[PDB]
């Protein structure tokens, strides 16, 4: 069965998801990738994996030479399993210097909770069975 | 308590944040550890990052400490023990340290500060924490 938890709890999990999915740090890839995968429904997993597959795979392209830091600015909920997360990302080089402008992004998210996973390791990191059922991140175009 | 599955989630995140060391994530680990800690526990934690032997001063970004949690027992009544290892790394330059964290915890409700509420929605609070070497005898 699916469960609701209210806005304080949703914001917690939505924030953790965006922070894990949009971050890039060679030293925490395992954790970020694993967490993102565990918190994502099957179709969403496959979309996320594409970022780390093939010849433009993020981990192969950036390797240990750069980071992408994420700042979450705001989180809106519609109370029916839908949310918007406004965030920025900033790429840094191997010396911690900024390369490129801040990117203003908006994540449009569908989510639910499905109950605690059966696997121990999974249950330890996702006790409520939070699941992102849709996710896309798009540039916020600042008009004017 | 919110029951076994929720308590273990929070105990595990607490140990992972407190016992980890990575220059690049100090702000997040330290803020998180502090915010999940009752006042007396915070002061105990802060000691690790103060004085001539402060962890961040001594390790800087020359070394990291990686933490693996092996088990968590809940001894009802707001007590728990977490069996874990730590190990110092280069960019495994040291022996594994087998430790046991003895823990008291509770929940005090959503914090008022928004940045705090975002990271500790139930107001999980560690009320006592000691990490001690597990002496493997025999
Ligand atoms: Ca690092």
Question: If you compute it from the alpha carbons, what radius of gyration of chain A comes out, rounded to the nearest whole angstrom?
Answer: 16 Å
Helix content of chain A: 25-40%
Strand content of chain A: 25-35%
- CATH topology group of chain A: Nuclear Transport Factor 2, Chain: A
What is the terminal separation of chain A in angstroms?
46 Å
Q: Oligomerization state of this entry?
A: homodimer
Largest sheet of chain A: 4 strands, antiparallel
Strand order of the largest sheet of chain A: 1-2-3-4
Q: What's the number of domains of chain A?
A: 1
- What class would the helix/strand composition of chain A place it in? alpha+beta
Task: Give the overall shape of chain A.
Answer: globular
Series of H and E elements of chain A: HHHHEEEHE
PDB class: protein transport
Keywords: niaid, National Institute of Allergy and Infectious Diseases, Seattle Structural Genomics Center for Infectious Disease, host-specific interaction, outer membrane protein, type IV secretion system, VirB8, protein transport
Assembly: dimeric
Entry title: Crystal structure of the soluble domain of TrwG Type IV secretion machinery from Bartonella grahamii
């Amino acid at each position: 069965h699916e469960t609701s938890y209210g806005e304080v709890v949703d914001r917690y999990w939505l924030n953790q998801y965006v922070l894990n999915r949009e971050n890039y740090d060679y030293d925490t890839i395992q954790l970020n990738y694993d967490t993102t995968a565990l918190l994502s429904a099957a179709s969403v997993q496959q979309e996320y994996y594409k970022i780390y597959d093939g010849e433009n795979a993020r981990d192969k392209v950036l390797s240990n030479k750069a980071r992408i830091t994420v700042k979450v600015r705001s989180i809106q909920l519609n109370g029916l399993g839908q949310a918007t997360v406004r965030f920025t990302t900033q790429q840094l080089d191997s010396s911690g210097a900024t390369t490129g402008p801040k990117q203003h992004q908006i994540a449009t998210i569908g989510y639910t909770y499905v109950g605690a996973p059966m696997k121990s390791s999974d249950r330890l990191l996702n006790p409520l069975g939070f699941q992102i059922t849709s996710y896309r991140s798009d540039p916020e175009i600042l008009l004017n």
